[PDB]
């Protein structure tokens, strides 16, 4: 029943201060141990660090305890990480978990689902939604393809999600693709029945957070 | 500080197969240890901890195992779902540590793949670039060949391609490659086609559209 959601820029400038927030429900904050993890690109998972509320007691990975800082805020039940003077090697995905402690044994029981944060100079920029339109070409014997191309955003990451989360049998959404341009472009499909395409309604939808922007596109045949 | 060793790297297994994960601490952590699975895009999930209890939910085909240094994590009938990455973690010292990371792969008979064209949209063309699109559905084992032909000429560099991870339900691939040309290019040609080659298949494959036709 405990959930973590975190919040914070998709986006950061070298030399200066990620800050992110971890809002805890369904458990006081006033119990038990919160920290950050972070998984860098194609990395595995590091420990960053913990506070105890009730003390206010921190304990740190000591290869980033210089720059890392992390705090709590009892009258909202959140906890935050700030990490300054960031670099490119500071890219990742952050996760916030409560450690939960039962004598001896401690572990983390839940987490949050992470952010992706990119340290970089360059602009934000929100994508375009293409429709892949269904036809004879996309047709195979009974079964239809068709999806929606996301081009020329940046940083990561979109999501997508088909008829608002109603549809996800048969949905593909592929890894971004980092450009030539610099700018990231992915795509989604779903394959359906052949004879649902004039009956049944395709849309996807899609995010880009560090842009706020929002698109639904709808998908007909061609 | 305590090191955590964990191996091997990857493993590839068939459905129903018993797998074993170790973790080896640099010093002995008293069963101070629990065991993580994430799923690819997802936020990691306990599995087990202080070296053997199950966490709620867990499917019992997941079991822990070891004292002193030497930890398992050990599934005993590997399941498509299973497909991830686990970790390892000791809390028995701050600075709390993982281990490296295993990748678990499914190992399952040859599929060969679907192949779908897409021309570029209407709407794009507006401005002044065209992108087409190859799909490769629910293929098996991961190599394929996709080739892009224009009027028949290969094309080279021009083109890239993203590859799914493992499905959760039938353990298959899917691609999907991107050819980008100007729109002026593009409306200097007529055939427009994708080549694709793969274990599952006794020729190639080529679906291919014309502009406009
Ligand atoms: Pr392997």
């Known amino acids: 029943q405990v959930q973590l959601q975190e919040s914070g820029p998709g986006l950061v400038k070298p030399s200066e201060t990620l800050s992110l927030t971890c809002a805890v429900s369904?458990?006081?904050?006033?119990?038990?141990?919160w920290s950050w993890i972070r998984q860098p690109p194609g990395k595995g998972l590091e420990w960053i660090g913990r506070?105890?509320?009730?003390?206010?007691?921190?304990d740190y990975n000591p290869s980033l305890e210089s720059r890392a800082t992390i705090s709590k805020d009892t009258s909202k039940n959140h906890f935050s990480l700030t990490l300054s003077s960031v670099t490119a090697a500071d890219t990742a995905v952050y996760f916030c978990?409560?450690?939960?402690?039962?004598?001896?044994?401690?572990?983390?029981?839940?987490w949050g689902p992470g952010v992706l944060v990119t340290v970089s100079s360059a602009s934000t920029k929100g994508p375009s939604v293409f429709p892949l339109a269904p036809s004879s070409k996309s047709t195979s014997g009974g079964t239809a393809a068709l999806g929606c191309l996301v081009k020329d955003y940046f940083p990561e990451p979109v999501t997508v999600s088909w008829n608002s989360g109603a549809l996800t049998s048969g949905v593909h959404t592929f890894p971004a693709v980092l450009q030539s341009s610099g700018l990231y472009s992915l795509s989604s499909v779903v394959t359906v029945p052949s004879s649902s395409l004039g009956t049944q309604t395709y849309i996807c939808n899609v995010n880009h957070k560090p842009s706020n922007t929002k698109v639904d596109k709808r998908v007909e045949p061609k | 500080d305590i090191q955590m060793t964990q191996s091997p790297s990857s493993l590839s297994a068939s459905v129903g197969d018993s797998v074993t994960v170790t973790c080896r601490a640099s010093?002995?952590?008293?069963?101070?240890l629990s065991w993580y699975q994430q799923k690819p895009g997802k936020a990691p999930t306990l599995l087990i901890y202080a070296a053997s209890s199950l966490q709620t939910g867990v499917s019992s085909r997941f079991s822990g195992s070891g004292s002193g240094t030497d930890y398992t994590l050990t599934i005993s009938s590997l399941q498509p779902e299973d497909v991830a990455t686990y970790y390892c973690?000791?809390?028995?010292?701050?600075?709390?540590?993982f281990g490296q990371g295993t990748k678990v792969e499914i190992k399952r008979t040859v599929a060969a793949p679907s192949v779908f064209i897409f021309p570029p949209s209407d709407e794009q063309l507006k401005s002044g670039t065209a992108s087409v699109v190859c799909l490769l559905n629910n293929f098996y084992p991961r190599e394929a060949k996709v080739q892009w032909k224009v009027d028949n000429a290969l094309q080279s560099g021009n083109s890239q391609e993203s590859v799914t991870e493992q499905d959760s339900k039938d353990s298959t691939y899917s691609l999907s490659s991107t050819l980008t040309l100007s729109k002026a290019d593009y409306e200097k040609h007529k055939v427009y086609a994708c080549e694709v080659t793969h274990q599952g298949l006794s020729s190639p494959v080529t679906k291919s559209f014309n502009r406009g036709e």
């Open positions: 369904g458990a006081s904050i006033s119990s038990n141990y």
């Open positions: 010093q002995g952590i008293d069963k101070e």
């Open positions: 973690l000791q809390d028995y010292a701050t600075p709390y540590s």
């Open positions: 506070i105890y509320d009730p003390t206010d007691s921190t």
């Open positions: 978990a409560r450690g939960l402690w039962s004598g001896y044994f401690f572990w983390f029981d839940v």
